[PDB]
Ligand binder design. Structure first.
Ligand SMILES: [Mg+2]
Ligand SMILES: [Mg+2]
Ligand SMILES: [Mg+2]
Ligand SMILES: [Mg+2]
Ligand SMILES: [Mg+2]
Ligand SMILES: [Mg+2]
Ligand SMILES: [Mg+2]
Ligand SMILES: [Mg+2]
Ligand SMILES: [Mg+2]
Ligand SMILES: [Mg+2]
Ligand SMILES: [Mg+2]
Ligand SMILES: [Mg+2]
Ligand SMILES: [Mg+2]
Ligand SMILES: [Mg+2]
Ligand SMILES: [Mg+2]
Ligand SMILES: [Mg+2]
Ligand SMILES: [Mg+2]
Ligand SMILES: [Mg+2]
Ligand SMILES: [Mg+2]
Ligand SMILES: [Mg+2]
Ligand SMILES: [Mg+2]
Ligand SMILES: [Mg+2]
Ligand SMILES: [Mg+2]
Ligand SMILES: [Mg+2]
Ligand SMILES: [Mg+2]
Ligand SMILES: [Mg+2]
Ligand SMILES: [Mg+2]
Ligand SMILES: [Mg+2]
Ligand SMILES: [Mg+2]
Ligand SMILES: [Mg+2]
Ligand SMILES: [Mg+2]
Ligand SMILES: [Mg+2]
Ligand SMILES: [Mg+2]
Ligand SMILES: [Mg+2]
Ligand SMILES: [Mg+2]
Ligand SMILES: [Mg+2]
Ligand SMILES: [Mg+2]
Ligand SMILES: [Mg+2]
Ligand SMILES: [Mg+2]
Ligand SMILES: [Mg+2]
Ligand SMILES: [Mg+2]
Ligand SMILES: [Mg+2]
Ligand SMILES: [Mg+2]
Ligand SMILES: [Mg+2]
Ligand SMILES: [Mg+2]
Ligand SMILES: [Mg+2]
Ligand SMILES: [Mg+2]
Ligand SMILES: [Mg+2]
Ligand SMILES: [Mg+2]
Ligand SMILES: [Mg+2]
Ligand SMILES: [Mg+2]
Ligand SMILES: [Mg+2]
Ligand SMILES: [Mg+2]
Ligand SMILES: [Mg+2]
Ligand SMILES: [Mg+2]
Ligand SMILES: [Mg+2]
Ligand SMILES: [Mg+2]
Ligand SMILES: [Mg+2]
Ligand SMILES: [Mg+2]
Ligand SMILES: [Mg+2]
Ligand SMILES: [Mg+2]
Lengths: 66, 138, 111, 80, 45, 181
RNA sequence: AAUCCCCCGUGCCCAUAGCGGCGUGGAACCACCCGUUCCCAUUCCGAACACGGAAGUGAAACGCGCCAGCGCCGAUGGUACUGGGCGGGCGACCGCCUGGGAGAGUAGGUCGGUGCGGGGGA
RNA sequence: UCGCCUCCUAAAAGGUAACGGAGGCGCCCAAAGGUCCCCUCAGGCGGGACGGAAAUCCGCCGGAGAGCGCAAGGGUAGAAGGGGGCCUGACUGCGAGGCCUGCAAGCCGAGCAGGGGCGAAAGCCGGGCCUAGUGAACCGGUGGUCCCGUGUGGAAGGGCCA
RNA sequence: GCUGACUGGGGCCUGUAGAGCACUGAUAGGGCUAGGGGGCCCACCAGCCUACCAAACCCUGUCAAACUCCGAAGGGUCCCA
RNA sequence: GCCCGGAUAGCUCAGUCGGUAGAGCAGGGGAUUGAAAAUCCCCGUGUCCUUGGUUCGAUUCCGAGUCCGGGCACCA
RNA sequence: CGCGGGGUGGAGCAGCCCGGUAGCUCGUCGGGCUCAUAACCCGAAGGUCGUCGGUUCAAAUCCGGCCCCCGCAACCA
RNA sequence: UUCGGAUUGGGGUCUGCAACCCGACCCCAUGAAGCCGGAAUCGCUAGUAAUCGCGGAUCAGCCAUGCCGCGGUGAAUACG
């Protein structure tokens, strides 16, 4: 890497909906990540929260009782 | 009519009719052929005249192969005299031993009688042939 | 991908040398050793050989090289050989290869 | 234009070719080949001029060499 | 645009070609004289 | 730095899984991961190359390498384009610096993408490298959202010494690449 | 010290040495390799070039083999053409003597040969 | 239509005609020049946000079909193509020897000397891959210069070099 | 004053006759396939059949002054008689 | 050649005893009317033919200049 | 056959030189004014430049072929 | 845009034999055009014009922003 012209890329800390990624090793140490998926909310480590498909599921249910 | 699309040059030198030979000559597509005995520039309009003689001869039926093609441009002057070349106005150059035409999928008396009519439309002497061992395999 | 940058660079530099028509002082250098071979083209022939490999010496591949260059001079100058041109092959004139060259004086030279 | 004649030019023959052949005695400076591309490459004792013209560099005899895919080559052999 | 090109002294020099609207500047470069050896040479006239 | 968690993760527990799966006479035959090349094409900056060096500043920030600038191969009419001009930035990272970036990409960036039901698994290029592309740059940690004057995405290319996509797939899965299966 | 064999340079023939497939080699050469402090680097990247190395591997590359699917080469025989000498046809054109003689194609060949030097075995 | 370049005609040396078949030139570039160092195309298929037949990127295949300012041809990646750093040899004084050729012209050119450029060097460098991009002499303009200077010193006016 | 035309031998040069289709083009019959002519099921990505268009590509079959993977006979020049 | 006179925001342009400047049909905003217009009322960097230079000072003074015009030149 | 000019929304003309950009009048369409139509006013649509090729990054524009248009010529015989 | 609530998604309430075509109403989500309107053109002279709500007829329910009415606040301006 040519000497001049460069971000620092110095060891860091960092945060999320989870705890830390000690890994870091980036420019601009100590950053705040809004939420990740990995660390397993939101997709990975499937939460499947709020979950859909209820549209065929419902109309066949409220229907024949009424 | 019969004629190329796309020529690279519009007009081209006459050249010789020499040394009757070279390619075609072995009856590759069909049952009987019409082979050329003499050299000639045969014209896009004599070719079509032979074709239609034959297709008219059998019931729109049979199958016809042609197998010479008019890519050589033929110029003529107007009744002027001498300045520039040109103009217009197409031929296939045909030496001895060539198979033009060559019908197939018809009866012997048919093919042979069509090819005889077809031959009358040509400027040269012709020969009707059948097909051979000699016409190989390839 | 045919005929690599190595063998273009190779050929390019070689042919230029070969035109001037001196004897060729030709340099192979591997990761481990560095060899140098003085050639007369048109007789298709090597005349004066010198390796680190055959002089069985080691450490600091550059300082090894100045040595296999001094080795060549002493060896070569002994056959009458003085003027030649430096082949340098597919190698930047630098470091190890520069060093063998600036060790190939006390004889030889203009390099 | 088209008919009357739009044609009618050509350019002077450039009189290009080999001007000395194999086993032919030459002097330094004689030119051996006149040519458009690198059609013959210069060999031993042979220069190229800016127009790809091959000349003897030394007196000698001229030998022709066909190095196959390396081209053809003209050299002058001394005993000059 | 044919080009007449001097240095400074004795004004004899040597002659050239810039047909062009660039360079438009004093248009100067290093050349040998008939007079001593290898001086400055600025364009002119 | 030579430590870098993903690098580590690759050696202890990604490599061996891989050998168990395909099984490999040689230590080399088991896939390494070489070269993540990040390429921004920007027609966006065309007549204005002033905009450009802000975007280059941005890549550096998230890459830690300053990008070089690609310039236009041939000249083409329909969208502007003198054969002179700069089209985009392209930055090659390897070796540590690729790792320290791929980590960040896996554990931060891609999570922050709106939707993201996972990376497309057909983008393997058939000889076993993989490509994807991103719409916004603010999905990265080093970017503050107030430093974006305008959105420009990029093309990430990841080169792999695996001869096939199958193997290649395995490597990146095992590294933690979220896949839409 | 000759001779052979293997490697490393390096020439020559200029594809009969090429592609593809398969197989093989790490002691020694060679390579990839370890690192990037230093010389020197990269329009970004020690990829390349460069240096200081030597833990590992012949995976890649290279080297050595073996396969004729392709690629390349290629008779003999016969024709075409033709220098020279003669005929024939209104013509377009044809033929004979004597001397030269292809191209295509068929048969077949080929997975290279070799010089100098080194390192290692004979 | 008239001079110049390219191709065919042109009969495998050169040369070769017609109001034969077809195209181009009357410029251009201070970088499109010199050198040293590096790099290698067009196309096809696969992959990649805005990117579509085509902007950029990644992978494999691709011996040249690309590029070489412009016509064609010959040539050319073992560079003549593309990038970069230094630079101005797009020098002065000559020129062995040849190509060509009715003359006059046109063309190539090693080598020596002066002072330089790039290069560790060998070396290369007297414009540009090459073949068109041009015009005898006479008359005159300008810058210089030693030369002549109509009794003599000047000057007028010339010569010579550009 | 033996060097001449011509002739013998040996080298080098060449790209015509012939022939070929590797290039540039043209080109018959068939095959397999991009794009579509659109029959229409759409009118949402669709989407199939083509006895019309059709690249490239394979098979068979040809043509060329300004095409050549090839290529004679001859010709030219030098040397020795 | 050249003498020179001609070069305006949006165009024609109009403006040299030098001390930061403009009119009409245009453009637009606004009153009028059948409307078109005319008339009436308000705003538009024209760094006014370029650079360096005299001055506090510049369309409007000194060296070159870029361009324009006629009339006169010349042309081997 | 010869030389010169042309061919562009429905009509009639610019634009072509000098490559990148299609404009003007009328007509047509929608609205207004009028009892109504015309006139008049406010809006809009409408084209690939005869054609086939080639040049270029790019063609109405530059080059070539062909097809039409108009003009001139066709003399000594 | 806490402007403006057109369009659409899902959830329901009521009438009614029955709300796909075609009901009104509630809630959650959605939030479009619209920054005072070209030529042109309407009403109004006082408790009027603006503006604000309220009732009824028809009627199961309602597409009523309509229509017939009721009051609250309450201008401007007429030279001619
Ligand atoms: Mg025949
Ligand atoms: Mg044949
Ligand atoms: Mg006839
Ligand atoms: Mg007559
Ligand atoms: Mg007959
Ligand atoms: Mg010629
Ligand atoms: Mg895939
Ligand atoms: Mg791979
Ligand atoms: Mg070959
Ligand atoms: Mg080993
Ligand atoms: Mg081992
Ligand atoms: Mg291997
Ligand atoms: Mg053969
Ligand atoms: Mg034979
Ligand atoms: Mg004969
Ligand atoms: Mg005869
Ligand atoms: Mg043969
Ligand atoms: Mg082989
Ligand atoms: Mg060898
Ligand atoms: Mg040995
Ligand atoms: Mg040719
Ligand atoms: Mg000839
Ligand atoms: Mg001849
Ligand atoms: Mg002309
Ligand atoms: Mg340079
Ligand atoms: Mg390529
Ligand atoms: Mg490509
Ligand atoms: Mg692609
Ligand atoms: Mg080429
Ligand atoms: Mg060219
Ligand atoms: Mg060419
Ligand atoms: Mg001379
Ligand atoms: Mg002469
Ligand atoms: Mg000197
Ligand atoms: Mg020096
Ligand atoms: Mg010289
Ligand atoms: Mg005279
Ligand atoms: Mg004079
Ligand atoms: Mg006197
Ligand atoms: Mg005197
Ligand atoms: Mg006197
Ligand atoms: Mg005087
Ligand atoms: Mg004698
Ligand atoms: Mg001979
Ligand atoms: Mg022929
Ligand atoms: Mg062909
Ligand atoms: Mg021919
Ligand atoms: Mg052969
Ligand atoms: Mg004799
Ligand atoms: Mg019109
Ligand atoms: Mg109307
Ligand atoms: Mg009306
Ligand atoms: Mg036309
Ligand atoms: Mg075009
Ligand atoms: Mg008369
Ligand atoms: Mg309904
Ligand atoms: Mg507001
Ligand atoms: Mg309104
Ligand atoms: Mg009243
Ligand atoms: Mg009600
Ligand atoms: Mg109400």
């Amino acid at each position: 890497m040519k000497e001049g012209i460069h971000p620092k890329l110095v060891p860091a800390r960092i945060i999320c909906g989870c705890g830390n990624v000690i890994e870091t090793y980036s420019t601009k140490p100590e950053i705040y990540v809004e939420v990740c998926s990995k660390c397993h909310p939101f997709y990975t480590g499937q939460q499947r929260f709020v979950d859909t498909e209820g549209r065929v599921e419902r109309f066949q249910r409220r229907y024949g009782d009424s | 009519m019969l004629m190329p699309r796309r020529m690279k040059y519009r007009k081209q030198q006459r050249g010789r009719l020499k040394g009757a030979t070279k390619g075609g000559d072995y009856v590759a597509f069909g049952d009987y052929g019409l082979v050329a005995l003499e050299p000639a520039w045969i014209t896009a309009q004599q070719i079509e005249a032979a074709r239609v003689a034959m297709v008219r001869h059998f019931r729109r039926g049979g199958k016809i192969f042609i197998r010479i093609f008019p890519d050589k441009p033929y110029t003529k002057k107007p009744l002027e005299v001498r300045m520039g070349k040109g103009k217009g106005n197409y031929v296939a150059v045909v030496k001895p031993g060539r198979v033009m035409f060559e019908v197939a999928g018809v009866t012997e008396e048919q093919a042979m009688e069509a090819l005889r009519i077809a031959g009358h439309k040509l400027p040269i002497k012709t020969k009707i042939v059948r097909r051979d061992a000699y016409d190989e395999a390839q | 991908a045919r005929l690599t940058a190595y063998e273009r660079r190779k050929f390019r530099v070689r042919n230029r040398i070969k035109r001037t028509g001196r004897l060729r002082l030709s340099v192979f250098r591997s990761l481990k050793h560095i060899y140098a071979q003085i050639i007369d083209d048109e007789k298709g022939v090597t005349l004066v050989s010198a390796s680190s490999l055959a002089l069985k010496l080691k450490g600091n591949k550059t300082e090894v090289a100045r040595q296999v260059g001094r080795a060549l001079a002493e060896k070569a100058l002994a056959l009458g050989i003085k003027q030649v041109a430096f082949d340098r092959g597919p190698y930047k004139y630098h470091g190890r290869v520069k060093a063998l060259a600036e060790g190939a004086r006390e004889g030889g030279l203009e390099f | 234009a088209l008919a009357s004649t739009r044609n009618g030019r050509d350019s002077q023959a450039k009189r290009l070719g080999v001007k000395r052949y194999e086993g032919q005695v030459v002097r330094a400076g004689n030119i051996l080949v006149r040519q458009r591309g690198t059609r013959f490459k210069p060999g031993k004792n042979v220069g190229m001029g800016r127009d790809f013209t091959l000349f003897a560099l030394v007196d000698g005899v001229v030998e022709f060499q066909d190095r196959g895919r390396l081209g053809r080559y003209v050299h002058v052999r001394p005993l000059a | 645009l044919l080009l007449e090109c001097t240095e400074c002294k004795r004004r004899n020099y040597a002659t050239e070609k810039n047909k062009r609207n660039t360079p438009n500047k004093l248009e100067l470069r290093k050349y040998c004289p008939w007079c001593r050896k290898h001086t400055v040479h600025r364009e002119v006239k | 730095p030579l430590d870098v968690a993903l690098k580590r993760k690759y050696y202890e527990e990604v490599r061996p899984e891989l050998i168990r799966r395909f099984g490999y006479q040689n230590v080399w035959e088991v896939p390494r991961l070489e070269k993540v090349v990040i390429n921004q094409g920007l027609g966006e900056a065309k007549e204005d190359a002033r905009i450009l060096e802000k975007a280059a500043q941005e890549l550096a920030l998230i890459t830690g390498q300053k990008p070089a600038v690609t310039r236009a191969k041939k000249s083409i009419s329909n969208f502007k384009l003198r054969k002179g001009m700069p089209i985009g930035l392209r930055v090659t990272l390897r070796r540590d610096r690729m790792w320290i970036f791929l980590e960040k990409l896996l554990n931060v960036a891609l999570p922050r993408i709106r939707d993201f039901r996972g990376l497309n698994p057909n983008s393997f290029d058939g000889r076993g490298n993989y490509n994807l592309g991103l719409r916004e740059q603010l999905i990265f940690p080093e970017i503050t959202y107030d430093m974006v004057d305008a959105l420009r995405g990029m093309d990430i290319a990841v080169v792999t010494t695996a001869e096939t996509d199958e193997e290649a797939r395995a490597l990146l899965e095992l590294l933690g690449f979220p896949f839409r299966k």
